[PDB]
Swiss-Prot record, chain A:
Superkingdom assignment: Bacteria
Protein name: Small ribosomal subunit protein bS6
Portion of the parent chain present: 1 to 100 of 135
GO molecular function: mRNA 5'-UTR binding; small ribosomal subunit rRNA binding; structural constituent of ribosome
In-chain residues carrying the UniProt-annotated modification N6-acetyllysine: 93
Family (UniProt): Belongs to the bacterial ribosomal protein bS6 family.
Quaternary context: Part of the 30S ribosomal subunit. Interacts weakly with uL2 in one of the 3.5 A resolved structures.
PTM comment: 5 different forms of the protein, varying only in the number of C-terminal glutamate residues, were isolated. The sequence shown is form bS6-6, which is the longest. The first two Glu are encoded by the rpsF gene, the other Glu are added post-translationally by the RimK enzyme.
Key words, A-Z: Acetylation, Ribonucleoprotein, Ribosomal protein, RNA-binding, rRNA-binding
Gene Ontology biological-process annotations: cytoplasmic translation
From Swiss-Prot, chain C:
Keywords, alphabetical: Acetylation, Ribonucleoprotein, Ribosomal protein, RNA-binding, rRNA-binding
Chain's gene name: rpsR
Family that this chain belongs to: Belongs to the bacterial ribosomal protein bS18 family.
GO molecular function: mRNA 5'-UTR binding; small ribosomal subunit rRNA binding; structural constituent of ribosome
Transmembrane segments: none
Name of the protein this chain belongs to: Small ribosomal subunit protein bS18
Gene Ontology biological process terms, A to Z: cytoplasmic translation; translation
GO cellular component: cytoplasm; cytosol; cytosolic small ribosomal subunit
Species name: Escherichia coli (strain K12)
Full-protein residues shown: 20 to 74 of 75
Key word rRNA-binding present: yes
Assembly mode: Part of the 30S ribosomal subunit. Forms a tight heterodimer with protein bS6.
Curated annotation (Swiss-Prot), chain D:
Biological function: Probbly involved in recognition of ribosome rescue factor SmrB in stalled/collided disomes; fusion of protein fragments to its N-terminus decreases ribosome rescue in the presence of SmrB.
Record note on quaternary structure: Part of the 30S ribosomal subunit. In stalled ribosomes contacts ribosome rescue factor SmrB.
Parent-record interval covered: 4 to 54 of 71
BP terms from Gene Ontology: cytoplasmic translation; ribosomal small subunit assembly
GO CC term (a single one): cytosol
The keyword Repeat belongs to this UniProt entry's keyword annotation: no
Compositionally biased spans, kind Basic residues: 43-51
Protein name: Small ribosomal subunit protein bS21
Family: Belongs to the bacterial ribosomal protein bS21 family.
Highest rank taxon of the organism: Bacteria
Keywords of this entry: Ribonucleoprotein, Ribosomal protein, RNA-binding, rRNA-binding
The UniProt record lists the keyword Glycoprotein: no
Lineage of source species: Bacteria, Pseudomonadati, Pseudomonadota, Gammaproteobacteria, Enterobacterales
Swiss-Prot record, chain E:
Function: Located on the platform of the 30S subunit, it bridges several disparate RNA helices of the 16S rRNA. Forms part of the Shine-Dalgarno cleft in the 70S ribosome.
Gene Ontology MF terms in the entry: small ribosomal subunit rRNA binding; structural constituent of ribosome
A biological process term (GO) from this entry: translation
Family listed: Belongs to the universal ribosomal protein uS11 family.
PROSITE patterns: RIBOSOMAL_S11
Signal peptide interval: none
Gene3D superfamilies, alphabetized: Ribosomal protein S11
Pfam family, one: Ribosomal_S11
Stated name of the protein: Small ribosomal subunit protein uS11
Key word Lyase present: no
Lineage: Bacteria, Pseudomonadati, Pseudomonadota, Gammaproteobacteria, Enterobacterales
Keywords: Methylation, Ribonucleoprotein, Ribosomal protein, RNA-binding, rRNA-binding
Designated gene of the protein: rpsK
Subunit structure: Part of the 30S ribosomal subunit. Interacts with proteins uS7 and bS18. Cross-links to IF-3. In stalled ribosomes contacts ribosome rescue factor SmrB.
InterPro entries (UniProt xref): Ribosomal_uS11, Ribosomal_uS11_bac-type, Ribosomal_uS11_CS, Ribosomal_uS11_sf
Length: 100, 88, 55, 51, 117
RNA sequence: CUUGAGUCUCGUAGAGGGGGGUAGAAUUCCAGGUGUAGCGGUGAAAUGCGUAGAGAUCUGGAGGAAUACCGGUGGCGAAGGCGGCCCCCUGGACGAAGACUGACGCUCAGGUGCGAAAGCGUGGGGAGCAAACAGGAUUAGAUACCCUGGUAGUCCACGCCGUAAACGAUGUCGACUUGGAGGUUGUGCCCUUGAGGCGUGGCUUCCGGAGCUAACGCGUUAAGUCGACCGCCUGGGGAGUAC
C-alpha cells in the first residue's frame, strides 16, 4: 500500500455529516489493512474564492496508506455525494504525519 | 520498471547462484518480464508510441543478448529458451 | 516553503493579483521555485489561496 | 486591482494597477497571438539582455 | 429621484471610445454618458479629454439621485481610463474604492489577426 | 581479463508518452432586472448592430477551446514535438557507492516504425479565430492589405497522407587539444556554525586561443587533431519536370 494525502472539504450546513463521513472512510481503509498516519480537520474555514457560492466550507485531512484499489472506490464516492464539494488527493511522498 | 520483489525474485531463479543480476541468463528473463507485461499496457492505449520506444529497444536487446549466449555457450542458450517459452 | 497548507509562507510569493512572484524578485533557486510555485496552484484549487484579487 | 484610501485627499495610487496587470498582459493580447514569435522573437530578448 | 446617496462608477475605456455608467451598488444602471455621444467624433472622441467632458455629463444625472459618494470600476486601456476618475473625484463626488475590473484571460480565447499595415 | 557495453541497489529532476478526471480567468450565446440614444469600427469612414430599446451595468444559466502569473540563457524527448491541478498505466536520462555478466560493441544499403501544419475518410463537437464567399472603404484599377460578417477548418475518436527554411541549413559512435564567464540538475567534503566555501559527474548558454576557413566564422557541445561505418555532391536554366 502507498500513502495518499487526501483533503476533502464538505458543505457548510452539512457539518453533522463530517464525523459520519470520516468514521466511515477510516473503517473501509483500515478494513483493507490500510494505515492512517494522520487526520486533521480545518473545520468550518473561510474560503478564498466563492467555490460555487457559500464562501465557507469544512475541510479534513487523511494522508492514509491504503491500496490504490480502495482509495479508488472512494475517489468516486466523493463525486456521488452532494454533501461534499471539491476533493483532492496526492500520492505517497513518504508517510506524512502530524503538523499542518 | 519492474517490481522490486519480482525483480530480485526472478534473479535468484536464473542467476548462476545468488546476487548476480549481471548474469547473462538473468538479463533475458528479467527483461522478458517487462516485455511480456507491457503487452497489456500497450494492448490498451496503443498510441503510446513514445513508450513503445522503450519496449522495442529492450526487445531488440533481448535478441542481441540471446545471440551472444548461443555464441559463447550453446548449452545455456537452448535451455533458457525453454523455461521462458521463447523462440516462436 | 513547499506545501499548500502553509498558506502563510505562500503569501510571501504572491502579489495582490494573486499571481506568484518571479524567481528573480525573490532571488530564490529555480529548483525551489518550481516545487514552490506548484504549491500555490494546488492551494488555489482548495480555496486556500486567491486566483486573483477579484475572484 | 483593488484600492481604497482613508481621508479624502484624492490619490489614485495607480501603481498597484500597472505594477502587474493593465497593459502588457493586455496590449500583448490586444491583437492576434504569436504562435511562432514567442519561441523566437520573444527568446531574442536575451540577445539584448546578455548585454 | 429616489436618493441613493451612493453607488458605483463604471468606465469602459476602449481604444476608440469611452463611456461612464453610474449605478447603485446593486448594479442597476442609474445614469450613463458616452464620449462619442458628446459631440466630437472619431479621432477627437478617442482622446483623454473626451472622457472627462463626457464623464462630467454623466454626473449631470446620477447626482440628482441623492448620490453623495461612489466607487470606481475601470476596465480596458485607452485614454480617459484615468481621466474619467479625476472628473468625478473632482466633481465633488466623494471617492472611495478604485478597482480595475479590466478582464485578463489565463489563456483561453484566440485574439483576431487583423492589424497588418 | 575488465577499462567498452549491459544487469542490480539506491536515490535525482523533468511542458517525455497513453488514459481518465478536474479548477479558475475570459469569450460568445440565452433569460431576465436596471438604464437611454447611441454602440461598433477607421487614417478617416462606411457596411453593420441600436427606440422591436443596443451598448454599458447586474443576476442566473449553456457551451467550446485554451491554460495569465510561475517561465528562464529553463526542463524533457530520437525526431516531430511536449506547459494549470489531480490520479492511473508507462519510457528514457543522470549521480552515487559499490555487487554482477564478461567484448555481449560501433555503424548499417534494403526493411520497420515514429512523422508540424495543411489536406482526405467516417462519425461526433463548434466559443473564438478564420481560406472560401459576402458586403463596406481604399485606388487609376485593388479579384489585396483595412473594416463588417462568415463556411471549411481548427477541437475529438479511429484510419489515410508522409511533406516543411522537418534547420545547428552542421549523420552516428569513440579518443585527444590552452582558457574565462554563467544557467541546470546529481554527489563528496568545510567552526556546514551560512544560502556561505571547496571540490567533483550529466546537461546547457556566452566570450574566445591554437588550429581550421575563401571569408563570414567554428572553437574541449568544433567546422581543431584522428579513427569505424553510412548518406549525399560533380555547372546554371530546362527540372525535382516528363516517361
Ligand atoms: Mg477578415
Ligand atoms: Mg491535422
Ligand atoms: Mg476532417
Ligand atoms: Mg537535452
Ligand atoms: Mg566563439
Amino acid at each position: 500500500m502507498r500513502h495518499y494525502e487526501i483533503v476533502f472539504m464538505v458543505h457548510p450546513d452539512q457539518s453533522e455529516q463530517v464525523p459520519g463521513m470520516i468514521e466511515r472512510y477510516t473503517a473501509a481503509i483500515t478494513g483493507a489493512e490500510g494505515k492512517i498516519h494522520r487526520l486533521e480537520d480545518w473545520g468550518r474555514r473561510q474560503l478564498a474564492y466563492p467555490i460555487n457560492k457559500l464562501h465557507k466550507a469544512h475541510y479534513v485531512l487523511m494522508n492514509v496508506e491504503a491500496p490504490q484499489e480502495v482509495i479508488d472506490e472512494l475517489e468516486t464516492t466523493f463525486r456521488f455525494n452532494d454533501a461534499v464539494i471539491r476533493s483532492m488527493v496526492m500520492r505517497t511522498k513518504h508517510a506524512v504525519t502530524e503538523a499542518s | 520498471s519492474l517490481s522490486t520483489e519480482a525483480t530480485a525474485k526472478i534473479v535468484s531463479e536464473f542467476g548462476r547462484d545468488a546476487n548476480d543480476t549481471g548474469s547473462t541468463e538473468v538479463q533475458v528473463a528479467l527483461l522478458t518480464a517487462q516485455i511480456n507485461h507491457l503487452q497489456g499496457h500497450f494492448a490498451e492505449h496503443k498510441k503510446d508510441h513514445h513508450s513503445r520506444r522503450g519496449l522495442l529497444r529492450m526487445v531488440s536487446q533481448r535478441r542481441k543478448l540471446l545471440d551472444y549466449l548461443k555464441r559463447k555457450d550453446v548449452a545455456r542458450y537452448t535451455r533458457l529458451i525453454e523455461r521462458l517459452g521463447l523462440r516462436r | 516553503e513547499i506545501d499548500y497548507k502553509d498558506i502563510a509562507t505562500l503569501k510571501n510569493y504572491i502579489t495582490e493579483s494573486g499571481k506568484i512572484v518571479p524567481s528573480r524578485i525573490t532571488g530564490t533557486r529555480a529548483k525551489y521555485q518550481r516545487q514552490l510555485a506548484r504549491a500555490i496552484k494546488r492551494a488555489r484549487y482548495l480555496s486556500l489561496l486567491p486566483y486573483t484579487d477579484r475572484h | 486591482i483593488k484600492v481604497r484610501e482613508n481621508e479624502p485627499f484624492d490619490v489614485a495610487l495607480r501603481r498597484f494597477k500597472r505594477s502587474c496587470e493593465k497593459a502588457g498582459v493586455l496590449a500583448e493580447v490586444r491583437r492576434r497571438e504569436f504562435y511562432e514569435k514567442p519561441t523566437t522573437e520573444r527568446k531574442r530578448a536575451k540577445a539584448s539582455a546578455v548585454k | 429621484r429616489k436618493q441613493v446617496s451612493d453607488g458605483v462608477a463604471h468606465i469602459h475605456a476602449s481604444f476608440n471610445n469611452t463611456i461612464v455608467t453610474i449605478t447603485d451598488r446593486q448594479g442597476n444602471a442609474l445614469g450613463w454618458a458616452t464620449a462619442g455621444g458628446s459631440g466630437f467624433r472619431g479621432s477627437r472622441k478617442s482622446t483623454p479629454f473626451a472622457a472627462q467632458v463626457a464623464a462630467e455629463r454623466c454626473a449631470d444625472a446620477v447626482k440628482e439621485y441623492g448620490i453623495k459618494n461612489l466607487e470606481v470600476m475601470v476596465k480596458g486601456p485607452g485614454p480617459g481610463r484615468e481621466s474619467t476618475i479625476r472628473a468625478l473625484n473632482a466633481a465633488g463626488f466623494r471617492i472611495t474604492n478604485i478597482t480595475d475590473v479590466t478582464p485578463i484571460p489565463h489563456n483561453g480565447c484566440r485574439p483576431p489577426k487583423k492589424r497588418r499595415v
